[PDB]
Amino acid sequence: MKQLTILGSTGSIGCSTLDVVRHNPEHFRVVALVAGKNVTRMVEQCLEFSPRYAVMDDEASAKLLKTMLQQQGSRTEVLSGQQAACDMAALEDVDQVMAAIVGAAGLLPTLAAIRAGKTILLANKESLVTCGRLFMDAVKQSKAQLLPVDSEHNAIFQSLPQPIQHNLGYADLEQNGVVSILLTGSGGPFRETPLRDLATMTPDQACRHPNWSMGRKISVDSATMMNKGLEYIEARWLFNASASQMEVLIHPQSVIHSMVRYQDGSVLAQLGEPDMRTPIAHTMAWPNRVNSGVKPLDFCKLSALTFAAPDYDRYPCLKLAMEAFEQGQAATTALNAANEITVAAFLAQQIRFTDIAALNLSVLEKMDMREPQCVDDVLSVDANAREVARKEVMRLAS
Amino acid sequence: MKQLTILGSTGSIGCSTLDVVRHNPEHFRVVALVAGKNVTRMVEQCLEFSPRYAVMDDEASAKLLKTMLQQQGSRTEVLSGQQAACDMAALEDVDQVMAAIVGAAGLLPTLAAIRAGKTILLANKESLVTCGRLFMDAVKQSKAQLLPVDSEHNAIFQSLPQPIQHNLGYADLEQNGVVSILLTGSGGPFRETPLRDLATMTPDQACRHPNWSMGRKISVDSATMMNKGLEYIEARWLFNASASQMEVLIHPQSVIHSMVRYQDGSVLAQLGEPDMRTPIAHTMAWPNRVNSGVKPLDFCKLSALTFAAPDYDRYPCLKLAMEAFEQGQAATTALNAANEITVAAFLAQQIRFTDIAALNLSVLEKMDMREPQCVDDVLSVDANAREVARKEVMRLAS
Ligand SMILES: NC(=O)C1=CN([C@@H]2O[C@H](COP(=O)(O)OP(=O)(O)OC[C@H]3O[C@@H](n4cnc5c(N)ncnc54)[C@H](OP(=O)(O)O)[C@@H]3O)[C@@H](O)[C@H]2O)C=CC1
Ligand SMILES: NC(=O)C1=CN([C@@H]2O[C@H](COP(=O)(O)OP(=O)(O)OC[C@H]3O[C@@H](n4cnc5c(N)ncnc54)[C@H](OP(=O)(O)O)[C@@H]3O)[C@@H](O)[C@H]2O)C=CC1
Ligand SMILES: O=CN(O)CCCP(=O)(O)O
Ligand SMILES: O=CN(O)CCCP(=O)(O)O
């Protein structure tokens, strides 16, 4: 049996992860749950799975949680704060850490798991994007194995040969017959929206993905295709790919999750229902397999699968992220930090949908800072670009 | 470097194979070529690649070949007949044998390669279909590794995990997380032809595949979907799959070549241009990769990819083959033998297109014979069902 600490257990991926455990009691046991403010969800999960520990990031939420748990007679002890999260990710009995906190806030707890040599089920993409080579150095230095959870990177992982799978980010693609990595695809809920209508799209409209049920941040990133930009940066670190070995493709139907080109013409791909339990269960069981709760993909009830090239006028964010990689880690760290702030601003109805890409570009220009040489510098650049992002948000606020 | 005997070098797959060699002189060398009657093609290939030996099955064709070769000053020695083919497939210097003769005639030379412990690049599907468990017993008994060349079985092979790849036909699918094998797909050139028009389709119309350039036999089998029936039988032996672990799906566009379901919902698939150099080059280089001459599949210039369930009224042959597997090896051997005769009859304009499935059914009923216990019995059943098939052909001939 394998034992998990789940970071961000109350989110969409954390809930999908717990459902995989729920469908496989004899293979998986949850030792610790870690979240932020969602008390009702955490108390559902603590009473159900009886974890040893439960962390809420915010102190007042931990108090409410302990009151309900101690009333029912639960054995789950409640802690709080960032360091508690880091300690839960480094427990001796833990075999796997589902890194599924949203944004760069999940960096430090995820790095604690990596320093303790845990198997990292990596979903929290903003952490790798913002930390870059320093994240990959930390994994190599320790005894830790990265298993990508993100639909796209998991699909690519499953379509890569074993020398790559067993030396992720350090193996050579060309030596193993890989020409490029094909990153798909959805294109968001405003794919077919007229360009001049994009600015009037509300948060509720941006969070209604046709195929995916996700958190709010990641759903807005799907709409702007900043998600694909962040996954592009991430894929280059995860799979040791250069700009010329990367491709980006819109696939509206979200059936194909991503692909890998090979020298002989072959393209290996992962397919299935647009449902995160599948890739989550891939990593939890790898190199074996388990049932995830997802039913078999019925090919006779599908929409015709199409592909199209991404239009940078429709998706200014994609361009921002792809060029931020060429600009370096300071700009990338600054971009991700800015995108976190502007997406939050958009959801709070402070700015318009298309203001996300305008203000993101603005923050990047106003940032002038040295390339991070350590994790502290990564957080200093992140903190400083958030300050700038907030100022710009208020420059477009009613 | 690796050295090949190519069986059926002058056919469509043999030509595709030689083009892979042509694109990789430093990785591949042809020691021997083996064909039937196509003298102009064999003399092209002997003068180009300067093989040690060249076999033509028919004696008069070997004479014509030797005349031209000895005039130019070629070092290639010409032999003839079936035993010569078997000896070429068992030469000490040979590393790989491309089994690409059409029909059951390729059985014995392919079995010679298997007894000599060669790496079998298996394209000749009628040999495995007609020989069944006895073919798989011969491979296990020897030091031989099967690498499927057929578009579909190669795609499946590339989408299966390594324990299956390294113990093909003897490994357990369920233990390795495989739920089913998804076999696609094209549906032939008469897919959208009205049912009542099928009987007036000419040989020339049946050999015009939208996506594939193949030999005539295999193209008619695509039109009746007997090809998919033969690949269904073959897939069950190659990958140790039961009826419930097999699926059949029409995919008109021929972009996806076949897929594999997994327990967690995952479906791994191979994609690419409909071009046999790709899967051929997969096997020749495996587990490495080489260039095959096939360009990268442009996803932005594709037709929408559709899938549909096969209709047995449109494709009576598919039903015949799937049920012939339940009926045993004698019926399967008899069916394949009958289909060889009727497809030949159709191409020679002796019977109509839809007469293929009628006469195939007829032969099966009139056959009453014991299950083969050895290779000799397989050939006795094959020989006897050809006799019957010929009689039935003349019962519908003008
Ligand atoms: N959902 C999906 O289909 C996919 C998500 N991802 C990525 O995975 C990550 C998770 O996304 P998703 O689950 O959708 O986001 P959600 O908004 O649904 O949930 C995020 C989780 O993180 C927790 N969290 C936030 N801040 C902290 C903190 N500082 N300390 C500890 N926990 C915190 C939240 O707790 P709480 O809610 O209690 O406040 C919540 O449980 C993201 O980085 C996303 O980009 C990648 C591919 C797919
Ligand atoms: N073409 C394709 O895309 C695919 C083919 N296959 C299978 O692979 C095999 C090859 O098919 P394909 O190349 O299309 O067929 P072709 O008709 O194009 O060629 C068949 C080859 O076999 C040779 N041959 C026939 N009889 C004998 C004999 N008795 N002794 C030695 N050689 C002989 C022919 O020689 P000659 O022409 O000189 O008489 C020819 O070179 C078939 O079993 C087919 O089902 C499977 C998947 C795809
Ligand atoms: O894992 C899932 N994602 O990454 C979100 C996919 C939606 P997109 O393809 O529009 O980014
Ligand atoms: O390798 C190629 N084939 O098997 C022929 C494919 C055409 P079909 O899918 O119609 O059988």
From Swiss-Prot, chains A, B:
<feature type="binding site">
    <location>
        <position position="228"/>
    </location>
    <ligand>
        <name>1-deoxy-D-xylulose 5-phosphate</name>
    </ligand>
</feature>
<dbReference type="InterPro" id="IPR003821">
    <property type="entry name" value="DXP_reductoisomerase"/>
</dbReference>
<keyword id="KW-0479">Metal-binding</keyword>
<comment type="similarity">
    <text>Belongs to the DXR family.</text>
</comment>
<dbReference type="InterPro" id="IPR013512">
    <property type="entry name" value="DXP_reductoisomerase_N"/>
</dbReference>
<dbReference type="Pfam" id="PF08436">
    <property type="entry name" value="DXP_redisom_C"/>
</dbReference>
<feature type="binding site">
    <location>
        <position position="125"/>
    </location>
    <ligand>
        <name>1-deoxy-D-xylulose 5-phosphate</name>
    </ligand>
</feature>
<feature type="binding site">
    <location>
        <position position="11"/>
    </location>
    <ligand>
        <name>NADPH</name>
    </ligand>
</feature>
<keyword id="KW-0460">Magnesium</keyword>
<keyword id="KW-0414">Isoprene biosynthesis</keyword>
<comment type="function">
    <text>Catalyzes the NADPH-dependent rearrangement and reduction of 1-deoxy-D-xylulose-5-phosphate (DXP) to 2-C-methyl-D-erythritol 4-phosphate (MEP).</text>
</comment>
<feature type="binding site">
    <location>
        <position position="151"/>
    </location>
    <ligand>
        <name>1-deoxy-D-xylulose 5-phosphate</name>
    </ligand>
</feature>
<dbReference type="Pfam" id="PF02670">
    <property type="entry name" value="DXP_reductoisom"/>
</dbReference>
<feature type="binding site">
    <location>
        <position position="37"/>
    </location>
    <ligand>
        <name>NADPH</name>
    </ligand>
</feature>
<dbReference type="InterPro" id="IPR036291">
    <property type="entry name" value="NAD(P)-bd_dom_sf"/>
</dbReference>
<comment type="pathway">
    <text>Isoprenoid biosynthesis; isopentenyl diphosphate biosynthesis via DXP pathway; isopentenyl diphosphate from 1-deoxy-D-xylulose 5-phosphate: step 1/6.</text>
</comment>
<feature type="binding site">
    <location>
        <position position="13"/>
    </location>
    <ligand>
        <name>NADPH</name>
    </ligand>
</feature>
<dbReference type="GO" id="GO:0070402">
    <property type="term" value="F:NADPH binding"/>
</dbReference>
<feature type="binding site">
    <location>
        <position position="231"/>
    </location>
    <ligand>
        <name>1-deoxy-D-xylulose 5-phosphate</name>
    </ligand>
</feature>
<dbReference type="GO" id="GO:1990065">
    <property type="term" value="C:Dxr protein complex"/>
</dbReference>
<keyword id="KW-0464">Manganese</keyword>
<feature type="binding site">
    <location>
        <position position="38"/>
    </location>
    <ligand>
        <name>NADPH</name>
    </ligand>
</feature>
<feature type="binding site">
    <location>
        <position position="12"/>
    </location>
    <ligand>
        <name>NADPH</name>
    </ligand>
</feature>
<feature type="binding site">
    <location>
        <position position="186"/>
    </location>
    <ligand>
        <name>1-deoxy-D-xylulose 5-phosphate</name>
    </ligand>
</feature>
<feature type="binding site">
    <location>
        <position position="126"/>
    </location>
    <ligand>
        <name>NADPH</name>
    </ligand>
</feature>
<feature type="binding site">
    <location>
        <position position="36"/>
    </location>
    <ligand>
        <name>NADPH</name>
    </ligand>
</feature>
<comment type="subunit">
    <text>Homodimer.</text>
</comment>
<keyword id="KW-0560">Oxidoreductase</keyword>
<feature type="binding site">
    <location>
        <position position="231"/>
    </location>
    <ligand>
        <name>Mn(2+)</name>
    </ligand>
</feature>
<protein>
    <recommendedName>
        <fullName>1-deoxy-D-xylulose 5-phosphate reductoisomerase</fullName>
        <ecNumber>1.1.1.267</ecNumber>
    </recommendedName>
</protein>
<feature type="binding site">
    <location>
        <position position="215"/>
    </location>
    <ligand>
        <name>NADPH</name>
    </ligand>
</feature>
<feature type="binding site">
    <location>
        <position position="209"/>
    </location>
    <ligand>
        <name>1-deoxy-D-xylulose 5-phosphate</name>
    </ligand>
</feature>
<dbReference type="InterPro" id="IPR026877">
    <property type="entry name" value="DXPR_C"/>
</dbReference>
<keyword id="KW-0521">NADP</keyword>
<dbReference type="GO" id="GO:0042802">
    <property type="term" value="F:identical protein binding"/>
</dbReference>
<dbReference type="GO" id="GO:0030145">
    <property type="term" value="F:manganese ion binding"/>
</dbReference>
<dbReference type="GO" id="GO:0019288">
    <property type="term" value="P:isopentenyl diphosphate biosynthetic process, methylerythritol 4-phosphate pathway"/>
</dbReference>
<dbReference type="GO" id="GO:0051484">
    <property type="term" value="P:isopentenyl diphosphate biosynthetic process, methylerythritol 4-phosphate pathway involved in terpenoid biosynthetic process"/>
</dbReference>
<feature type="binding site">
    <location>
        <position position="222"/>
    </location>
    <ligand>
        <name>1-deoxy-D-xylulose 5-phosphate</name>
    </ligand>
</feature>
<keyword id="KW-0170">Cobalt</keyword>
<feature type="binding site">
    <location>
        <position position="10"/>
    </location>
    <ligand>
        <name>NADPH</name>
    </ligand>
</feature>
<feature type="binding site">
    <location>
        <position position="124"/>
    </location>
    <ligand>
        <name>NADPH</name>
    </ligand>
</feature>
